Write a protein that holds these residues in place. Structure first.
Motif, PDB file in Angstrom:
ATOM      1  N   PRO A 130       4.023  -7.909 -25.880  1.00  0.00           N
ATOM      2  CA  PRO A 130       3.914  -9.020 -24.932  1.00  0.00           C
ATOM      3  C   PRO A 130       3.294 -10.292 -25.531  1.00  0.00           C
ATOM      4  O   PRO A 130       3.630 -11.377 -25.093  1.00  0.00           O
ATOM      5  CB  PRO A 130       2.960  -8.488 -23.842  1.00  0.00           C
ATOM      6  CG  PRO A 130       2.924  -6.985 -24.040  1.00  0.00           C
ATOM      7  CD  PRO A 130       3.145  -6.782 -25.522  1.00  0.00           C
ATOM      8  N   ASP A 131       2.393 -10.106 -26.498  1.00  0.00           N
ATOM      9  CA  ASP A 131       1.605 -11.160 -27.191  1.00  0.00           C
ATOM     10  C   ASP A 131       2.104 -11.290 -28.636  1.00  0.00           C
ATOM     11  O   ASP A 131       1.385 -11.893 -29.460  1.00  0.00           O
ATOM     12  CB  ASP A 131       0.116 -10.800 -27.168  1.00  0.00           C
ATOM     13  CG  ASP A 131      -0.197  -9.486 -27.870  1.00  0.00           C
ATOM     14  OD1 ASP A 131       0.760  -8.765 -28.220  1.00  0.00           O
ATOM     15  OD2 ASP A 131      -1.391  -9.194 -28.071  1.00  0.00           O
ATOM     16  N   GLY A 132       3.274 -10.711 -28.928  1.00  0.00           N
ATOM     17  CA  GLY A 132       3.845 -10.616 -30.283  1.00  0.00           C
ATOM     18  C   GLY A 132       4.046 -11.983 -30.911  1.00  0.00           C
ATOM     19  O   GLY A 132       3.703 -12.151 -32.098  1.00  0.00           O
ATOM     20  N   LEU A 133       4.578 -12.932 -30.141  1.00  0.00           N
ATOM     21  CA  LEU A 133       4.855 -14.314 -30.611  1.00  0.00           C
ATOM     22  C   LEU A 133       3.971 -15.310 -29.869  1.00  0.00           C
ATOM     23  O   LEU A 133       3.491 -14.992 -28.769  1.00  0.00           O
ATOM     24  CB  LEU A 133       6.325 -14.667 -30.379  1.00  0.00           C
ATOM     25  CG  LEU A 133       7.333 -13.753 -31.063  1.00  0.00           C
ATOM     26  CD1 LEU A 133       8.695 -14.418 -31.115  1.00  0.00           C
ATOM     27  CD2 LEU A 133       6.865 -13.360 -32.456  1.00  0.00           C
ATOM     28  N   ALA A 134       3.785 -16.472 -30.489  1.00  0.00           N
ATOM     29  CA  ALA A 134       3.262 -17.706 -29.874  1.00  0.00           C
ATOM     30  C   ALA A 134       4.192 -18.848 -30.283  1.00  0.00           C
ATOM     31  O   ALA A 134       4.344 -19.070 -31.507  1.00  0.00           O
ATOM     32  CB  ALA A 134       1.843 -17.949 -30.318  1.00  0.00           C
ATOM     33  N   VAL A 135       4.810 -19.515 -29.305  1.00  0.00           N
ATOM     34  CA  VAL A 135       5.663 -20.711 -29.552  1.00  0.00           C
ATOM     35  C   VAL A 135       4.896 -21.946 -29.082  1.00  0.00           C
ATOM     36  O   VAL A 135       4.532 -22.010 -27.890  1.00  0.00           O
ATOM     37  CB  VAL A 135       7.044 -20.609 -28.883  1.00  0.00           C
ATOM     38  CG1 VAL A 135       7.889 -21.838 -29.173  1.00  0.00           C
ATOM     39  CG2 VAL A 135       7.777 -19.358 -29.326  1.00  0.00           C
ATOM     40  N   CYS A 139       8.023 -11.633 -24.929  1.00  0.00           N
ATOM     41  CA  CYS A 139       7.085 -11.359 -26.049  1.00  0.00           C
ATOM     42  C   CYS A 139       6.345 -12.628 -26.487  1.00  0.00           C
ATOM     43  O   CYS A 139       5.689 -12.577 -27.553  1.00  0.00           O
ATOM     44  CB  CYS A 139       7.858 -10.813 -27.242  1.00  0.00           C
ATOM     45  SG  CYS A 139       9.067 -11.987 -27.909  1.00  0.00           S
ATOM     46  N   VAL A 140       6.424 -13.714 -25.709  1.00  0.00           N
ATOM     47  CA  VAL A 140       5.952 -15.064 -26.144  1.00  0.00           C
ATOM     48  C   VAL A 140       4.758 -15.494 -25.287  1.00  0.00           C
ATOM     49  O   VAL A 140       4.868 -15.462 -24.046  1.00  0.00           O
ATOM     50  CB  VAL A 140       7.079 -16.115 -26.092  1.00  0.00           C
ATOM     51  CG1 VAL A 140       6.642 -17.443 -26.691  1.00  0.00           C
ATOM     52  CG2 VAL A 140       8.338 -15.618 -26.780  1.00  0.00           C
ATOM     53  N   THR A 146      -0.464 -23.327 -21.012  1.00  0.00           N
ATOM     54  CA  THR A 146      -0.108 -21.995 -21.562  1.00  0.00           C
ATOM     55  C   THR A 146       0.219 -21.031 -20.421  1.00  0.00           C
ATOM     56  O   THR A 146      -0.361 -21.161 -19.334  1.00  0.00           O
ATOM     57  CB  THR A 146      -1.208 -21.430 -22.469  1.00  0.00           C
ATOM     58  OG1 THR A 146      -0.681 -20.257 -23.087  1.00  0.00           O
ATOM     59  CG2 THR A 146      -2.481 -21.079 -21.730  1.00  0.00           C
ATOM     60  N   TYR A 147       1.122 -20.096 -20.692  1.00  0.00           N
ATOM     61  CA  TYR A 147       1.537 -19.021 -19.758  1.00  0.00           C
ATOM     62  C   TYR A 147       2.253 -17.954 -20.575  1.00  0.00           C
ATOM     63  O   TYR A 147       2.759 -18.238 -21.660  1.00  0.00           O
ATOM     64  CB  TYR A 147       2.419 -19.588 -18.644  1.00  0.00           C
ATOM     65  CG  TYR A 147       3.824 -19.900 -19.086  1.00  0.00           C
ATOM     66  CD1 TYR A 147       4.135 -21.105 -19.693  1.00  0.00           C
ATOM     67  CD2 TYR A 147       4.837 -18.973 -18.926  1.00  0.00           C
ATOM     68  CE1 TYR A 147       5.427 -21.385 -20.117  1.00  0.00           C
ATOM     69  CE2 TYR A 147       6.130 -19.234 -19.352  1.00  0.00           C
ATOM     70  CZ  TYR A 147       6.427 -20.443 -19.953  1.00  0.00           C
ATOM     71  OH  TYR A 147       7.702 -20.699 -20.370  1.00  0.00           O
ATOM     72  N   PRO A 148       2.311 -16.696 -20.090  1.00  0.00           N
ATOM     73  CA  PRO A 148       3.069 -15.648 -20.767  1.00  0.00           C
ATOM     74  C   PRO A 148       4.551 -15.713 -20.365  1.00  0.00           C
ATOM     75  O   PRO A 148       4.835 -15.782 -19.175  1.00  0.00           O
ATOM     76  CB  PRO A 148       2.366 -14.376 -20.283  1.00  0.00           C
ATOM     77  CG  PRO A 148       1.914 -14.718 -18.882  1.00  0.00           C
ATOM     78  CD  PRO A 148       1.643 -16.209 -18.878  1.00  0.00           C
ATOM     79  N   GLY A 149       5.451 -15.710 -21.354  1.00  0.00           N
ATOM     80  CA  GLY A 149       6.896 -15.909 -21.134  1.00  0.00           C
ATOM     81  C   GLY A 149       7.759 -15.147 -22.124  1.00  0.00           C
ATOM     82  O   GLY A 149       7.311 -14.105 -22.633  1.00  0.00           O
ATOM     83  N   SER A 150       8.960 -15.664 -22.375  1.00  0.00           N
ATOM     84  CA  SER A 150      10.040 -14.985 -23.133  1.00  0.00           C
ATOM     85  C   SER A 150      10.641 -15.933 -24.165  1.00  0.00           C
ATOM     86  O   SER A 150      10.387 -17.142 -24.094  1.00  0.00           O
ATOM     87  CB  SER A 150      11.127 -14.496 -22.208  1.00  0.00           C
ATOM     88  OG  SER A 150      11.918 -15.589 -21.753  1.00  0.00           O
ATOM     89  N   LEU A 151      11.458 -15.373 -25.052  1.00  0.00           N
ATOM     90  CA  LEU A 151      12.477 -16.121 -25.825  1.00  0.00           C
ATOM     91  C   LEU A 151      13.383 -16.840 -24.826  1.00  0.00           C
ATOM     92  O   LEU A 151      13.697 -16.223 -23.793  1.00  0.00           O
ATOM     93  CB  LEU A 151      13.277 -15.124 -26.662  1.00  0.00           C
ATOM     94  CG  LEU A 151      12.461 -14.281 -27.636  1.00  0.00           C
ATOM     95  CD1 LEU A 151      13.376 -13.394 -28.460  1.00  0.00           C
ATOM     96  CD2 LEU A 151      11.621 -15.165 -28.539  1.00  0.00           C
TER      97      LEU A 151
END
Ligand code: ZN
Length: 257
Positions: free
Chosen positions: A134-139, A202-203, A189-194
């Protein structure tokens, strides 16, 4: 084949990737009135000083400037992030017109384009394992308005003629990604997707308040690119952007009062 066309566009991505109708999909509209300030958010750290760009390439959806992510050379730390996120590549989404092109919107306002600097959490060893978390990437997402030309961007524009068609790539060394930032790192900031298939949730999204200026001259060069491969009927690479998805239960935290 997925794309941004009539039949293979975002409205139809769900047919092949059911997560498209998920609970953590990106992009989203940022409502300034409801995106509350968060004093728990730590200051955002950006270490692009020893950054090592390797090549630029056309992948038939956008163009990616890829970096050597073997070391902690160019890293994103703090803000909402837990641990060190290494820069792997940056790319853009843009429109056919100046009135549209950004994926994220702010109180429903679209920008001419959006820049995405993609990082992965070194906690998970490689990118492959990262995208499964879930926290795998940061864009880091930066808006583009049409104004004064961005000097830090001209080196990119000057090479686009050489990766016109899908599949083409070119050596692209000694590129400084610091050239593409605004002055204030004030973010939402917020938890989201590709925002492209497979749309994996995972972003950790970090969106800068401060857009950057680019000249119409620079953005016209973006729109001279091709979705198609070499020898195929021409399809100009434009409107390569997904519209805002439902926020649902998620909260958008602001880094500023
Ligand atoms: Zn993107």
């Amino acid at each position: 084949h997925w794309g941004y066309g009539k039949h293979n566009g975002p409205e139809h991505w769900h047919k092949d990737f059911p997560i498209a109708k998920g609970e953590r999909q990106s992009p989203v509209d940022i409502d300034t009135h409801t995106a509350k300030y968060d004093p728990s958010l730590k200051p955002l750290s950006v270490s692009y000083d020893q950054a090592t760009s390797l090549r630029i390439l056309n992948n038939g959806h956008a163009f990616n400037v890829e970096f050597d992510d073997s070391q902690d050379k160019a890293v994103l730390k703090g803000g909402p992030l837990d641990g060190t996120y290494r820069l792997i590549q940056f790319h853009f989404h843009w429109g056919s017109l100046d009135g549209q092109g950004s994926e994220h919107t702010v109180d429903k306002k679209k920008y001419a384009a959006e820049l995405h600097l993609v990082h992965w959490n070194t906690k998970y060893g490689d990118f492959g394992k990262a995208v499964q978390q879930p926290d795998g990437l940061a864009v880091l997402g930066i808006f583009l308005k049409v104004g004064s030309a961005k000097p830090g961007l001209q080196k990119v524009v000057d090479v686009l003629d050489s990766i016109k068609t899908k599949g083409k790539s070119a050596d692209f060394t000694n590129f400084d990604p610091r050239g593409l930032l605004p002055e204030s790192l004030d973010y939402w900031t917020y938890p989201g997707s590709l925002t492209t298939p497979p749309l994996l949730e995972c972003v950790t999204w970090i969106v800068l308040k401060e857009p950057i200026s680019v000249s119409s001259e620079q953005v016209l060069k973006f729109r001279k690119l091709n979705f198609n491969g070499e020898g195929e009927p021409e399809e100009l690479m434009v409107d390569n952007w997904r519209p805002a998805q439902p926020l649902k239960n998620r909260q958008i935290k602001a880094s500023f009062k």
